[PDB]
Amino acid sequence: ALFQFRSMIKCAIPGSHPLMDFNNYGCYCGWGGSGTPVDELDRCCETHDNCYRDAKNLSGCYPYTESYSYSCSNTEITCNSKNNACEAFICNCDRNAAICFSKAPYNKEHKNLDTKKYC
Amino acid sequence: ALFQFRSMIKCAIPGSHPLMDFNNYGCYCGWGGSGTPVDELDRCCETHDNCYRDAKNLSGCYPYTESYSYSCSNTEITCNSKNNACEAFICNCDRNAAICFSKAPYNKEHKNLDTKKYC
Ligand SMILES: CCCCCCCCCCCC(=O)N[C@H](CCCC)COP(=O)(O)OCCO
Ligand SMILES: CCCCCCCCCCCC(=O)N[C@H](CCCC)COP(=O)(O)OCCO
Ligand SMILES: [Ca+2]
Ligand SMILES: [Ca+2]
Ligand SMILES: [Ca+2]
Numbered sequence: 001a002l003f004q005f006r007s008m009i010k011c012a013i014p015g016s017h018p019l020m021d022f023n024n025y026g027c028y029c030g031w032g033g034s035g036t037p038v039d040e041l042d043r044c045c046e047t048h049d050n051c052y053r054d055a056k057n058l059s060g061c062y063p064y065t066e067s068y069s070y071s072c073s074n075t076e077i078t079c080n081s082k083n084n085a086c087e088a089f090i091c092n093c094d095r096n097a098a099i100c101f102s103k104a105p106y107n108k109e110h111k112n113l114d115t116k117k118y119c
Numbered sequence: 120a121l122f123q124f125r126s127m128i129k130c131a132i133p134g135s136h137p138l139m140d141f142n143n144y145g146c147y148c149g150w151g152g153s154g155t156p157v158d159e160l161d162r163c164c165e166t167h168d169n170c171y172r173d174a175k176n177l178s179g180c181y182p183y184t185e186s187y188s189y190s191c192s193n194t195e196i197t198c199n200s201k202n203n204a205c206e207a208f209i210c211n212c213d214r215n216a217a218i219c220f221s222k223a224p225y226n227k228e229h230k231n232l233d234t235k236k237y238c
Contacts, residue, residue: 001188001201001203003188003199003201004188060179065203066203067186067187067188067199067201067202067203067206068186069120069122069123069186080122080186082120082122082186083120083186084120084181084184084185084186087186
């Protein structure tokens with residue numbers, strides 16, 4: 001679920017403030033997304049968007065509100081192998097996005113980008 | 120989900136082995152259940168069974184496989200207020216049983232009861 005995602009980013013990147021750092025970044029980070037990703041981080045985002053999109057293909061699979069089971073044995077995220085298909089899928093989308101964010105450059109010039117004009 | 124319930128009992132009762140301890144106890148503790156519960160513990164089990172049985176009123180709610188968000192505060196069990204309706208409901212069933220088990224006498228003679236004759 002969305003609340004669990006927030007925490008998972010914290011696991012992977014301990015000194016992050018997910019809502020402040022990751023939301024409203026590039027053309028894709030945050031609710032919605034269009035155009036071409038401005039950079040590496042943005043692409044991380046667009047791939048999560050698309051990951052969620054493939055999920056709404058599992059019957060009754062709603063990514064924003066589907067709670068799964070996961071753990072953090074520090075910086076390392078583990079998706080419970082016991083999650084149902086839907087929960088598993090979504091956990092993967094989230095885990096991947098978290099690791100992707102942790103390994104990508106962060107351009108301050110892309111934070112709160114003018115989407116109507118650069119997207 | 121079932122795997123989470125196992126951990127949920129261990130939390131309310133640290134020295135327990137839920138699967139070896141409560142499964143196949145009385146008339147109701149384990150898959151299925153019938154007759155009149157032989158004891159207090161047995162009564163905790165019937166109640167959990169019927170809690171689940173109700174869950175199947177909510178749309179697309181599968182008690183055995185729906186994973187929720189919860190945590191163990193050192194004995195104390197907390198179901199995340201962020202759970203969706205189906206998750207929250209199932210979390211509660213589970214939490215109430217764990218607490219129930221905590222408080223009920225355990226009768227070793229009620230273990231592996233001859234169901235076919237006593238239930
Ligand atoms: C909610 C707080 C959790 C942490 C958020 C911080 C960064 C989120 C950006 C990641 C990509 C994105 O925009 N993913 C979204 C989820 C985040 C919503 C704000 C996918 O959902 P979106 O509807 O944009 O795409 C779905 C359709 O494909
Ligand atoms: C299996 C996971 C770890 C095992 C924990 C030990 C069993 C504890 C039983 C508690 C009551 C019960 O019987 N509750 C059950 C589920 C747990 C045992 C399978 C309700 O499920 P049941 O199908 O009996 O009833 C369904 C609705 O009537
Ligand atoms: Ca998005
Ligand atoms: Ca769930
Ligand atoms: Ca039962």
